[PDB]
Amino acid sequence: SIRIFPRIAGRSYIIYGQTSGIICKRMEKSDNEFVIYNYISEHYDKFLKKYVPKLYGKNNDMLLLEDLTYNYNNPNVMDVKIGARKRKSHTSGFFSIRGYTNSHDYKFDPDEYLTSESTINHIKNFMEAGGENRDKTKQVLLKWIMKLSELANDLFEINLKFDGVSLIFIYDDDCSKCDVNVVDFSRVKLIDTNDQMTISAVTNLIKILSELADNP
Numbered sequence: 001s002i003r004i005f006p007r008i009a010g011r012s013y014i015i016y017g018q019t020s021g022i023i024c025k026r027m028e029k030s031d032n033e034f035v036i037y038n039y040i041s042e043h044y045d046k047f048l049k050k051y052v053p054k055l056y057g058k059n060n061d062m063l064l065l066e067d068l069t070y071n072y073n074n075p076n077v078m079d080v081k082i083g084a085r086k087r088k089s090h091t092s093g094f095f096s097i098r099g100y101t102n103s104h105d106y107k108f109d110p111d112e113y114l115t116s117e118s119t120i121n122h123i124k125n126f127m128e129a130g131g132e133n134r135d136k137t138k139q140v141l142l143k144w145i146m147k148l149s150e151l152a153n154d155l156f157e158i159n160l161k162f163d164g165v166s167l168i169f170i171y172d173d174d175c176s177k178c179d180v181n182v183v184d185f186s187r188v189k190l191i192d193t194n195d196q197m198t199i200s201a202v203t204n205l206i207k208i209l210s211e212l213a214d215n216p
């Protein structure tokens with residue numbers, strides 16, 4: 001009947017859809033996540049199409065979402081919180097890594113505040129599954145940089161406060177495919193300006209990833 005989806009982070013009930021390519025995410029406390037998907041669709045439809053999993057529909061309290069891991073033979077996933085946290089400061093100052101595929105092997109702890117060096121080391125840990133072909137892993141980094149650059153550029157024109165939103169980074173072990181998308185609109189709010197904190201998270205990630213793609 002019910003297959004639990006292998007979540008990297010967060011607390012919401014998420015299960016595989018009864019059909020291929022879909023996950024079902026329960027809206028726990030309010031339907032705010034649905035209201036915000038609908039609002040972005042009406043006001044910023046190009047943003048939704050480029051950066052966000054497709055919302056196929058709703059069943060009671062369940063969102064039917066595009067499974068971002070579906071087209072991958074061996075997906076590696078990292079959840080980075082880029083929007084404001086509820087109370088805490090970010091573990092990496094401008095963002096918080098929330099989890100990644102195989103993080104347990106590296107003694108990753110989502111409660112641990114990280115130096116710049118430890119932050120970089122966890123991102124390198126996440127990239128270890130991608131293997132020793134430095135050319136192929138560099139290309140994954142560059143394609144993430146391309147899309148995050150455009151996202152940061154685009155965010156200047158969006159009047160939302162992206163509280164609690166995460167970037168879901170995905171690459172295949174063979175490094176033949178990768179993407180990054182924005183998820184988790186449960187705490188997002190309308191405002192009258194752009195979200196500078198969320199833009200700062202994205203530019204900081206671009207800086208770090210650019211250093212990784214350039215290191216010899």
Ligand SMILES: O=P(O)(O)O[C@@H]1[C@@H](OP(=O)(O)O)[C@H](OP(=O)(O)O)[C@@H](O)[C@H](O)[C@H]1OP(=O)(O)O
Pocket residue numbers: 009010011081084085086087088164
């Ligand atoms: O916004 P965060 O700091 O990243 O963490 C909140 C946690 O907030 P905080 O109060 O520790 O700042 C929330 O704690 P709560 O508001 O229940 O005391 C928790 O419910 C969310 O699942 C939790 O977020 P989650 O890990 O993305 O599920």
Ligand SMILES: Nc1ncnc2c1ncn2[C@@H]1O[C@H](COP(=O)(O)OP(=O)(O)O)[C@@H](O)[C@H]1O
Pocket residue numbers: 006007008009010011012013014023053065066067068069077079166168183184185186
């Ligand atoms: N569309 C998606 N495709 C694949 N995995 C997803 C998708 N949306 C969420 N996830 C997974 O679920 C986890 C929690 O997602 P999120 O939307 O942040 O829910 P929560 O409200 O529980 O924090 C992410 O870390 C990721 O592993």
Ligand SMILES: [Mg+2]
Pocket residue numbers: 009010164165166183184
């Ligand atoms: Mg989340």
